[PDB]
């Protein structure tokens, strides 16, 4: 079957792959859709180590073709997902405390195990969360990483209704972060990006304020217009956004780091201490987070911006991603 | 009366002052003693703006000599304190939510209002927390800032009993943080400093592990020996400790920033995100935090290491502090 495979020179080989038979607890999905995440870009670029040979993809939606021995959580015909959180150990300090994505034995689709950017994908059944009936597959692909991650990030931000949240980076994740923050958590939102087209879309979807941080001083403007944001979620792919977020929140405010540029942020210590700032990393979401995130999309509370592409376009898509030419998500369509 | 006043060239002049009359809600303290905090050093060096002319000190313990109009919270004869949190507004998003030290109209003793390093001090009665009867004045002075700050920091760290907490900087604050962490919160403690003599004190007081971060790679050792600390409290006066703390915690761990070096810390973004790290600033403690911190010292659960000095020694003390020669706290003794 055809798969997106990472190459040694950091490109994608759209090539032939043959899957092994199933083990106990596994299921085989015939894939319908797989979103392209910027994490796929980091992976293929070698940012998290050399993963030449891995099949990419962890916004995968597929239909169960076969189940392996012992499988009761899925049956043939079910629509299920292939997310970054592909499998946790189920029995550790993280897994049993409601923090399973931090499992130190975690397997991650499109990184440490073959992902869903291929015609077929093997999943661990109890970890392939089902898609609810009212949600179309292309939209569901976006929720499978972009959506769940930002739903969870906003949850973790401690933002309360009527409060100001600054969203940095309005791409695949960021646009959905805006929608969750506004439509689900009832926050007021500042949308911040270096790309005017991303900002145009944000305003179109209800961002209360929009700032181009390349031409403007984003933190200063947030402070002037809102009194300082109560929280921030940083989904941008550059350290400057993280640095700006620290200065954009009011005292006691929480910055949630989500973006993964291979860089360091700088945090002024007297600012951190004397203003009681908080900075916290967030990592995708638990299976329950994903279930909840899907249901919001099923009920139309968030609407993923998606465009369908054939698998052959994957290298071109990554160029578009690099160049900031994507509104929302590009979604690989395997449907014949 | 005599007062420690900040000079234009970042020293202290012992100066005669005559205090103004009390206003409504105020009280006059005849001071018994005043601890020297490293914050006094930052203040006099101009790290927080020029405060030439200000009376230093916010580890003050005094006896109420006189009360102004309307005062019922204090009466003549009471022993009360002069802390960093000298007065909050009492009616704002911070003051009413249990976060009063973050009040944006806060007055800080020894910085934005005359402090307690003088023979007399005017306090706002409702904000001058009383000292419990079972606690000697010199010991109480340390709890007034070093103690309440580290009590609150450990509380905020969310360390649970049996868990590992790394304490960076074992000075005036750090030695008390160790005592609170071990004796009150029942944590296992790693003590970390660049000074072997501070570490010896930590070990004497039951630190489970001690590490010299100058001669050893502290984070590596913490990871190796404990699997990574569940939390950290950083009271050190150098950015390297804040940077190391981020690497010394396990995934999901919380670093509580307390020290105030005029520097920035650096946070590797993928580490922050992929390991769900949390970094939060802590700022002294509420009046209730101080009351609780005082009570622990009164019952002997913590025992401040103190040495008494005359007011005339203040510049010398700051030199000892700068040079890393102080152990525990130096306390200005005004007593007869």
């Amino acid at each position: 079957m055809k798969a997106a495979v990472v190459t040694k020179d950091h490109h994608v080989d759209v090539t032939y792959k043959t899957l092994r038979s199933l083990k106990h607890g596994e299921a085989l999905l015939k894939m319908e859709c797989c979103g392209v995440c910027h994490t796929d870009l980091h992976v293929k670029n070698g940012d998290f180590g050399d993963k030449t040979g891995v099949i990419l993809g962890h916004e995968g939606i597929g239909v169960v073709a076969e189940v392996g021995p012992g499988v009761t959580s899925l049956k043939p015909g079910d629509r299920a997902s292939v997310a970054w959180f592909y499998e946790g150990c189920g029995h550790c300090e993280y897994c049993n405390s409601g923090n399973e994505t931090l499992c130190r034995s975690v397997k991650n689709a499109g990184y440490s195990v073959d992902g869903g950017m291929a015609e077929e994908c093997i999943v661990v059944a109890d970890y392939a969360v089902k898609v609810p009936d009212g949600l179309d597959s292309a939209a569901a692909s976006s929720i499978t990483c972009a959506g769940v991650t930002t739903y969870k990030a906003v949850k973790l931000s401690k933002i309360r209704p009527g409060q100001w949240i600054a969203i940095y980076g309005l791409g695949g994740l960021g646009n959905l972060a805006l929608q969750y923050a506004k439509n689900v958590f009832n926050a007021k939102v500042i949308a911040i990006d270096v790309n005017d087209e991303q900002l145009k879309l944000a305003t179109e979807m209800g961002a209360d304020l929009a700032i181009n941080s390349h031409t403007e001083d984003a933190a200063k403007i947030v402070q002037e217009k809102t009194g300082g944001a109560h929280a921030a979620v940083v989904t941008a792919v550059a350290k400057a956004a993280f640095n700006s977020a620290v200065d954009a929140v009011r005292a006691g405010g929480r910055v949630v780091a989500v973006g993964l540029p291979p860089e360091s942020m700088s945090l002024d210590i007297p600012r951190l201490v004397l203003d009681g700032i908080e900075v916290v990393g967030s990592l995708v979401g638990t299976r329950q987070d994903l279930t909840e995130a899907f249901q919001f999309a099923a009920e139309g509370k968030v609407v993923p911006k998606v465009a369908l592409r054939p698998l052959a376009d994957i290298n071109t898509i990554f160029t578009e991603m690099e160049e900031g030419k994507i509104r929302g998500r590009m979604v690989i369509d395997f449907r014949h | 009366m005599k007062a420690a006043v900040v000079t234009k060239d970042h020293h202290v002049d012992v100066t005669y002052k005559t205090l103004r009359s009390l206003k409504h809600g105020e009280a006059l303290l005849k001071m018994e003693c005043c601890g020297v905090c490293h914050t006094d050093l930052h203040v006099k060096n101009g790290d927080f703006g020029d405060k030439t002319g200000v009376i230093l000190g916010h580890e003050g313990i005094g006896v109420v000599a006189e009360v102004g109009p309307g005062v019922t919270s204090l009466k003549p004869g009471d022993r009360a304190s002069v802390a960093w949190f000298y007065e909050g507004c009492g009616h704002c998003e911070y003051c009413n939510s249990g976060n009063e030290t973050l009040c944006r109209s806060v007055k800080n003793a020894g910085y934005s209002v005359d402090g307690g390093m003088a023979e007399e001090c005017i306090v706002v009665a409702d904000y001058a927390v009383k000292v419990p009867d079972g606690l000697d004045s010199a010991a109480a002075s340390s709890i007034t800032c070093a103690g309440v700050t580290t009590y609150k920091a450990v509380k905020l760290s969310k360390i649970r009993p049996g868990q590992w907490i790394a304490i960076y900087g074992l000075g005036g604050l750090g030695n008390l943080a160790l005592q609170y962490a071990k004796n009150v919160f029942n944590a296992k403690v790693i003590a970390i400093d660049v000074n072997d003599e501070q570490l010896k004190l930590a070990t004497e007081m039951g630190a489970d592990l001690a590490i010299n971060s100058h001669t050893e790679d502290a984070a590596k050792i913490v990871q190796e020996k404990t699997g990574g600390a569940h939390a950290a409290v950083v009271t050190a006066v150098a950015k390297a400790a804040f940077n190391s703390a981020v690497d010394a915690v396990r995934a999901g761990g919380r670093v509580v920033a307390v020290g105030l070096p005029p520097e920035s810390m650096s946070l590797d973004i993928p580490r922050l995100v992929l390991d769900g790290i949390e970094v939060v600033g802590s700022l002294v403690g509420t009046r209730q935090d101080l009351t609780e911190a005082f009570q622990f010292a009164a019952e002997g659960k913590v025992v401040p290491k103190v040495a008494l000095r005359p007011l005339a020694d203040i510049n010398t003390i700051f030199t000892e502090m700068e040079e890393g020669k102080i152990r525990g706290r130096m306390v200005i003794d005004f007593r007869h």
């Binding site: 004397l274 | 944006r104 910085y111």
Partner: peptide
Amino acid sequence: AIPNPLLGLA
């Protein structure tokens, strides 16, 4: 002021 640790306070 904003930010401006401590100095920015009212």
